[PDB]
Every structure is written in structure tokens, then in C-alpha cells.
């Protein structure tokens, strides 16, 4: 695709079903102390779409159990929905607190 429009031009299919899981796979989570490249496999194996797995595919559990409904919101269309997966996991291992 040379010739045509000056710009760029590709209207068509807006995600990408590329990558998916078959086999049965174990259940993932992700913790203060996890990897920005676990992050990515929570994401998924949830069954969120790819437009967030790749805003939030980078930043490490800490960073991301930081970033609130807000946070979230922002970087990603789906962030009320990805947050509403994280309080499950920053409430295990720490919310209410003693002390």
C-alpha cells in the first residue's frame, strides 16, 4: 500500500484475537511484589481486552495496585473494570490493617 491517501489508512478491525489460551491453565494473581511482565498474563487469563493488557502490560503489580478506579479509568477505557479485579488482591494481602 504505496500510492493512495497521503496519511495512513486501515479501517477495518479494531482488536486483536490473536494469542489465545486452549489448554487449561492454572490460576493466575498478582501481588505488591509482582512483575510487570505477570501483569500482562493476569489480565488476559481475566478475559480483559488487549487495549488494556498493553497500557497496564508494563507496570509492575506494585505500580498497578496503586493506580485506582481513576488511575485506571484514564490509561484505560476498561480501568473501573480492571480496578474492580485488583481490590480482590491488595484485600488479601493487605486493606484493613491492626495497626
Same mark, same amino acid.
Given at each position: *500500500?504505496?500510492?493512495?491517501?497521503?496519511?495512513?489508512?486501515?479501517?477495518?478491525?479494531?482488536? =486483536? =484475537?490473536?494469542?489465545?489460551?486452549?489448554?487449561?491453565?492454572?490460576?493466575?494473581?498478582? +501481588?505488591?511484589?509482582?512483575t510487570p511482565e505477570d501483569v500482562k +498474563?493476569?489480565l488476559?487469563?481475566? *478475559?480483559?481486552?488487549?487495549?488494556t493488557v498493553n497500557s497496564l502490560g508494563v507496570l509492575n503489580g506494585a505500580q498497578l495496585?496503586?493506580l485506582? =478506579?481513576?488511575?485506571?479509568? +484514564?490509561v484505560c477505557?476498561?480501568?473501573?473494570?480492571?480496578?474492580?479485579?485488583?481490590?480482590?488482591? =491488595?484485600?488479601?494481602?493487605?486493606?484493613?490493617?491492626? *495497626?
Amino acid at each position: *500500500g504505496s500510492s493512495g491517501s497521503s496519511g495512513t489508512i486501515g479501517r477495518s478491525a479494531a482488536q =486483536k =484475537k490473536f494469542h489465545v489460551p486452549r489448554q487449561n491453565v492454572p490460576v493466575i494473581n498478582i +501481588t505488591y511484589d509482582s512483575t510487570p511482565e505477570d501483569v500482562k +498474563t493476569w489480565l488476559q487469563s481475566k *478475559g480483559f481486552n488487549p487495549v488494556t493488557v498493553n497500557s497496564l502490560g508494563v507496570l509492575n503489580g506494585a505500580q498497578l495496585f496503586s493506580l485506582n =478506579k481513576d488511575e485506571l479509568r +484514564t490509561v484505560c477505557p476498561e480501568g473501573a473494570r480492571v480496578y474492580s479485579q485488583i481490590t480482590v488482591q =491488595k484485600a488479601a494481602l493487605s486493606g484493613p490493617s491492626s *495497626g
